Amino acid sequence: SDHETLTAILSPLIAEREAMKSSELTLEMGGIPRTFKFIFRGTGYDEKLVREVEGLEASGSVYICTLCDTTRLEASQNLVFHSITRSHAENLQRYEVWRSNPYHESVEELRDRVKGVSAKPFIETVPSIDALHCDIGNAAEFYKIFQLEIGEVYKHPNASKEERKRWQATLDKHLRKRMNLKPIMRMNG
Amino acid sequence: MSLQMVTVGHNIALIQPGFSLMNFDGQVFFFGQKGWPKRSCPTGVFHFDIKQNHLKLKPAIFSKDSCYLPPLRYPATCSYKGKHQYIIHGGKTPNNELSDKIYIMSVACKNNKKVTFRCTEKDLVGDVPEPRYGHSIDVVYSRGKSMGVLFGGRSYMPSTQRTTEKWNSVADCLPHVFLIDFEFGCATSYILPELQDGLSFHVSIARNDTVYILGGHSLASNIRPANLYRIRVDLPLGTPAVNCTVLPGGISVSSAILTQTNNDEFVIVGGYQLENQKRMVCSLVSLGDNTIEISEMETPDWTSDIKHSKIWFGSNMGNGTIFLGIPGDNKQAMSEAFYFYTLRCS
Amino acid sequence: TFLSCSQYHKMYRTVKAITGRQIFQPLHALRNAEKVLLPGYHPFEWQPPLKNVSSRTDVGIIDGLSGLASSVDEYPVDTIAKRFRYDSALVSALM
Numbered sequence: 022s023d024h025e026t027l028t029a030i031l032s033p034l035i036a037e038r039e040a041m042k043s044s045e046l047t048l049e050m051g052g053i054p055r056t057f058k059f060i061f062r063g064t065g066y067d068e069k070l071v072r073e074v075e076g077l078e079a080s081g082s083v084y085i086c087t088l089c090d091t092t093r094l095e096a097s098q099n100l101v102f103h104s105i106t107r108s109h110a111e112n113l114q115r116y117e118v119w120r121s122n123p124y125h126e127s128v129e130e131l132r133d134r135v136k137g138v139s140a141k142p143f144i145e146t147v148p149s150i151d152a153l154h155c156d157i158g159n160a161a162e163f164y165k166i167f168q169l170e171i172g173e174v175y176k177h178p179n180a181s182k183e184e185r186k187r188w189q190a191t192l193d194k195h196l197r198k199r200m201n202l203k204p205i206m207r208m209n210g
Numbered sequence: 211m212s213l214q215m216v217t218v219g220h221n222i223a224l225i226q227p228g229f230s231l232m233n234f235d236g237q238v239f240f241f242g243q244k245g246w247p248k249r250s251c252p253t254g255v256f257h258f259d260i261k262q263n264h265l266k267l268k269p270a271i272f273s274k275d276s277c278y279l280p281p282l283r284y285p286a287t288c289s290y291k292g293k294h295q296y297i298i299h300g301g302k303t304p305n306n307e308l309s310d311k312i313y314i315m316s317v318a319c320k321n322n323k324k325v326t327f328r329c330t331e332k333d334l335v336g337d338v339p340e341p342r343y344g345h346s347i348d349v350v351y352s353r354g355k356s357m358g359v360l361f362g363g364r365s366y367m368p369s370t371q372r373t374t375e376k377w378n379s380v381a382d383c384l385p386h387v388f389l390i391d392f393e394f395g396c397a398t399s400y401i402l403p404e405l406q407d408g409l410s411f412h413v414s415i416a417r418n419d420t421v422y423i424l425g426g427h428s429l430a431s432n433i434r435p436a437n438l439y440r441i442r443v444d445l446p447l448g449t450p451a452v453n454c455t456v457l458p459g460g461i462s463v464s465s466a467i468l469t470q471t472n473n474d475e476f477v478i479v480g481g482y483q484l485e486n487q488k489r490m491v492c493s494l495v496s497l498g499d500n501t502i503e504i505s506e507m508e509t510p511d512w513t514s515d516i517k518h519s520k521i522w523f524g525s526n527m528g529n530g531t532i533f534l535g536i537p538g539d540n541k542q543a544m545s546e547a548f549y550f551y552t553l554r555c556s
Numbered sequence: 557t558f559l560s561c562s563q564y565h566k567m568y569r570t571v572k573a574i575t576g577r578q579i580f581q582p583l584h585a586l587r588n589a590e591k592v593l594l595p596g597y598h599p600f601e602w603q604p605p606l607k608n609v610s611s612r613t614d615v616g617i618i619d620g621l622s623g624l625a626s627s628v629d630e631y632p633v634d635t636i637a638k639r640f641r642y643d644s645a646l647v648s649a650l651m
């Protein structure tokens with residue numbers, strides 16, 4: 022999260038990475054020398070980092086998908102009909118539109134136009150989904166829905182935020198009584 | 211001379227070394243946060259309002275038509291007092307690119323202490339200077355007109371000798387002088403033959419026809435020269451002319467802080483003497499009609515945390531008032547990494 | 557097995573003391589077989605060559621700051637970082 026030192030260190034590496042995307046490589050491989058080309062796919066960043074270096078805002082935004090461009094509120098109405106529509110150079114030119122402010126729009130309407138981007142893209146990536154944190158987040162969400170559904174709040178909503186801690190206690194105790202589980206919070210794989 | 215300590219706001223993280231304090235209409239303002247502008251305030255410029263040594267960094271929205279500017283971290287700033295406005299050129303983005311464009315800070319409307327700023331992106335034509343930081347701009351008048359003097363500072367290697375093992379290395383700009391028209395943003399360089407060696411983090415004063423430069427940090431020999439130079443520009447209706455003269459009775463200081471303590475009367479607070487010696491004793495300068503006099507100022511009090519620290523930074527709040535910041539304490543571990551102080555000059 | 561050098565030396569000397577043979581190798585003989593396995597050993601040629609890239613093929617550890625000048629007048633830095641170059645580790649992984 023200390024953005025300064027991270028930029029100032031990693032920028033030689035991204036310089037070299039951009040450099041060797043347009044060449045051949047030649048070296049002796051056991052007898053005859055051979056040649057090489059390259060294609061890179063920066064993928065193994067988690068979710069928070071790729072929200073932090075490609076140029077999006079923090080995690081709690083309204084624009085949520087790092088691939089499509091939809092509001093969080095939009096995903097509640099329409100569920101599954103988008104497509105990937107976020108390149109790297111598109112985020113570069115959108116950053117340019119943000120810094121220039123050509124149409125003299127508001128802060129808010131321009132943020133509505135650029136679809137979230139408010140920093141210079143620092144590095145390239147390919148867009149995709151990390152598997153590990155997908156699994157972990159789904160497990161945490163299902164833990165949440167069980168801690169809800171024991172409290173039977175589908176009939177009556179908005180109880181206190183203490184009985185839910187009680188339901189948390191009884192869920193851990195009962196599942197240790199039926200599956201013999203040690204209690205932890207950092208949800209390991 | 212009156213020091214005082216000062217309490218801290220909750221979002222203290224936005225203060226870093228290399229900031230900028232602009233002073234609009236008796237009303238201070240902060241610029242140059244650390245890290246990109248967060249979603250809580252997308253501009254990056256903040257109300258630096260201070261009351262009873264407690265500051266409350268309120269945000270600041272822009273106009274409807276400004277150009278949203280990234281936090282430049284070591285810009286050149288000056289007071290174009292001709293409808294007050296400020297000038298920003300150079301600086302250093304958080305991705306350690308270096309822009310060279312100019313940004314002009316102005317006001318649109320002030321209604322009950324809620325202000326609207328207005329800043330404009332200004333492009334240059336002609337011999338554009340290399341994008342650099344640590345340098346110094348200043349404005350000057352002559353014969354009913356005004357122009358911008360710009361004295362160079364440190365920058366990256368050019369696009370040939372920049373190598374991926376020495377990528378972040380830095381060398382001085384070639385010590386030339388740039389003159390800039392802001393009616394159209396015209397540029398002109400001039401090769402002055404008296405100033406030879408590079409210089410950065412110097413201190414610049416402008417008195418309406420003439421520009422005075424002292425201090426500064428050479429890199430090539432890595433020393434701080436003990437001199438000062440007077441620059442006379444002139445604006446006839448023909449070509450503008452450049453002229454310089456060294457003047458004796460200077461000091462060696464590096465990255466200090468100036469302030470207008472009185473009408474044609476200024477004070478230089480301490481900086482660094484040697485590469486480990488922070489300069490403690492401050493100075494004052496009487497800037498006369500065609501004379502210039504530096505002098506020993508009355509040695510203001512320090513706390514032990516100041517005189518046993520190792521680095522400070524700060525800037526000029528505007529009215530005999532400077533704001534000063536040091537990092538935290540390693541042997542006194544409980545800290546939010548920074549502590550602050552304020553010096554008045556009454 | 558993540559064993560340090562000194563205990564490896566002790567293992568070496570007692571094995572040679574017990575069996576008379578020499579099955580493990582000594583440590584200088586270890587490093588002079590190690591240096592074939594880092595980055596920066598083997599010649600190669602970038603074609604068409606790379607701008608901003610030093611063309612020497614004898615690059616191992618350099619500092620990560622790229623010689624970022626760091627004194628009391630500049631921005632204060634506090635971090636340590638070591639790295640290779642990209643092509644060096646890439647050809648070493650290829651070989």
Ligand SMILES: [Zn+2]
Pocket residue numbers: 086087088089090091103104
């Ligand atoms: Zn989507």
